[PDB]
From a paper:
Here, we show that Yersinia pseudotuberculosis secretes an effector, CccR, that can act both as a toxin and as a transcriptional factor. CccR contains an N-terminal FIC domain and a C-terminal DNA-binding domain. In E. coli cells, the FIC domain of CccR AMPylates the cell division protein FtsZ, inducing cell filamentation and growth arrest. In Y. pseudotuberculosis cells, CccR inhibits its own expression by binding through its DNA-binding domain to the cccR promoter, and affects the expression of other genes through unclear mechanisms.
To understand the biological role of CccR at the molecular level, we determined its crystal structure using the single-wavelength anomalous method (SAD) at a 2.78 Å resolution. The crystallographic asymmetric unit contains two molecules of CccR assembled into a butterfly-shaped homodimer. The two CccR molecules within the homodimer are nearly identical to each other, as they were superimposed with a root-mean-square deviation value of 0.593 Å over 340 Cα atoms. Dimerization is mainly mediated by interactions formed between the α1 helices and the N-terminal loops of each CccR monomer. Specifically, the side chain of residue K175 from the α5-α6 loop of one monomer forms a salt bridge with the side chain of residue D22 from the α1 helix of the other monomer. AUC analysis indicated that simultaneous substitution of N13 and K175 with alanine abolishes dimerization. The 26-bp spacer between binding boxes is unusually large but is compatible with the 70.2 Å separation between DNA-binding helices observed in the CccR apo structure. As a Class II FIC protein, CccR contains an N terminal αinh (S59ARIEG). The crystal structure of CccR shows S59 and E63 form a stable hydrogen bond with R203 to prevent binding of the ATP substrate for modification.
Numbering used by the authors:
A (entry chain B): 5 to 79, 83 to 128, 135 to 143, 147 to 216, 218, 220 to 379
B (entry chain A): 2 to 126, 133 to 140, 148 to 379
């Protein structure tokens, strides 16, 4: 323990306490949303894709949003699989914590195993360091991992939950537990800690990478100050992380407002899609009704398409479902919602999300 | 008894302290933007009812013996405050409305403001003038410099995290100074209500009542025990006084913020208060239907009950409204307007509201 892993204790006059209470406001926020949960579910799928892209690109991945979206909608390369690996790792974190299970040391192992060989067929490093910090000896690593896992799972006061997310993030990289994939794994572990401590009481997307994708140079420069183990360096790291998380939830919480989502994302997405000839005006009219009402039936469009014969309206619904633009709410249901996550409307949504300032590149 | 000097300053506890817990606990509620369906004009009537309770509570602490039933009977019926005791509660209630009308968030609390709080407190019973003359209060020659120091402390642009601690610190130092001859207890409660308004507890909420006397009125020996612990001036005794005040304020905010829910307020307070007047044969059938609409809608105009009273012409509706305005059950929104609200603070409905408030646990006695 060049430095013992312990909780911090700033004075009330410190800016660290300022950021801690700030981020505790957004955790206890009792404001629910008016967005349909079936539309938010597709928004969460899109932002899982954005995080997987961002995390891999931090490690020098060359794939872009166009190439990844193209490989997902319709239609293999090695740089693509590294990214789908992270996407499977986020669904796993979601399902695992939703099933009621906890962040155990083996769960962190399964987290690392998927990040490197997603959905295929874990152990710590048996070698050593390849800055001004020396990763500990490979025989010390299991002890550090056990010391860290027990640290995050201690029943400390919920006021310490967000300081824990910061301390665990640096301590993980300070240990360097695995051979490769530490950067991708520590970001997935931060995501699970964010979900565990209560940021998803189902109307907010969490983008931890967007905090570190912002500056990158400050990210690693703050890690160096924390490597010392001195109180000043660790406090400066927790301030960088917690304020970065605060600024991120500031942005994503706008998508919780139904007016902001419809007017600045969903409705422009169709206008983009219609401008590009992806949908005609009859398909735009039907899809506009879907975002308004949440869902739609064929028997609902008798008045929104009054010049169309009833058989023509039924043909239009079948065309939309086969293309995935409309998707059924339940297996075998004839009640449909918009298809934003797996259809060509995803490009229009990414376009609106890009212009509204949610997507770097 | 002896006067020991003690420096007025902000505390600085560590993150692991219980005081930081209460400080952040209160900061959740100072910044909770509770969206309400309650009409602001309707809430204005409930505002003065809670002014009634604090004024009676602040007066009863300092020896006033009039009961809640006696005070209600002086407002609804009769007219004014003939007894000097009655005037003691009426002075506070008037000063309560003054702070509401003349002090807003962020605005500065001047030394003349605190002096006017004292002048209204003892008006008709030296007013707005300092002492000319356990813990001994400082000599009267030092009171002016101590009050100028306290006002600059309350008005200093210190970080908004310090606002809630400033409420507790200023409350203790004021009584520790004892700047006036009489009415110091009545005044410091008015100053605490002023500080809560200045530090922005009425901004983001259309309807939130704050009863600071209710913190120090549930107990009393504890209120004085925690003050005597703080008169020492030690850092321990001050943090414990702040801890007692902050938790007590947040605990009262928890009880009172339910009244911002229109369904809870209507079902548990306002609609029962209606049937209480109906049960005593104060209102009749049509009058109850009218007042039911005003409660659900917030206000009412004669054209707003064409389908509530279909057999009546608009001129007959107006006669029915005038009967309710004569008895104070309906009140014009402002002078000379033909829009009305339920008179919960002037009519028989005040009695029903107090009963419902007692049943739901807002009034001790």
């Amino acid at each position: 323990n060049h430095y013992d892993l312990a909780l911090l204790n700033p004075s009330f006059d410190s800016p660290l306490v300022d950021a801690l209470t700030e981020l505790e406001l957004l955790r206890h926020l009792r404001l629910e949303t008016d967005v349909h949960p079936l539309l938010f579910a597709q928004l969460k799928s899109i932002f899982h894709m954005l995080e997987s892209l961002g995390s891999a690109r931090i490690e020098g991945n060359h794939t872009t949003l166009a190439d990844y979206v193209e490989s997902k909608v319709e239609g293999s390369t090695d740089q693509l699989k590294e990214i789908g690996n992270i996407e499977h790792a986020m669904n796993f974190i979601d399902e695992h914590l939703h099933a009621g299970e906890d962040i155990t040391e083996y769960f962190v192992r399964e987290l690392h195993a998927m990040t490197v060989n997603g959905l295929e067929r874990g152990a710590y490093r048996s070698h050593g360091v390849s800055s001004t910090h020396l990763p500990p000896e490979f025989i010390h690593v299991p002890a550090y991992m056990q010391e860290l896992v027990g640290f995050m799972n201690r029943a400390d006061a919920p006021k310490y939950d967000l300081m824990k997310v910061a301390l665990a993030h640096h301590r993980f990289g300070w240990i360097h537990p695995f051979g490769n994939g530490n950067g991708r794994t520590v970001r997935l572990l931060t995501y699970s800690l964010l979900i565990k401590y209560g940021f998803n009481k189902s109307g907010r997307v969490l983008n931890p990478t967007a905090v570190f994708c912002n500056d990158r140079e400050r990210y690693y420069s703050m890690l160096a100050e924390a490597d010392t183990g001195a109180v000043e360096g660790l406090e400066q790291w927790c301030l960088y992380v917690l304020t970065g998380i605060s600024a991120e939830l500031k942005k994503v919480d706008k998508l919780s407002d139904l007016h902001f989502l419809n007017s600045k994302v969903l409705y422009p997405a169709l206008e983009y899609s219609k401008g590009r000839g992806v949908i005609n005006e009859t398909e735009s009219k039907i899809l506009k009704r879907t975002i308004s009402q949440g869902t739609v039936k064929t028997s609902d469009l008798k008045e929104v398409l009054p010049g169309l014969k009833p058989a023509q309206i039924t043909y239009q619904i079948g065309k939309l479902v086969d293309r995935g633009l409309l998707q059924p709410v339940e297996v075998g249901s004839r009640i449909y919602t918009a298809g934003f996550s797996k259809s060509d409307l995803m490009r229009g949504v990414i376009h609106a999300l890009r212009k509204e300032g949610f997507i770097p590149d």
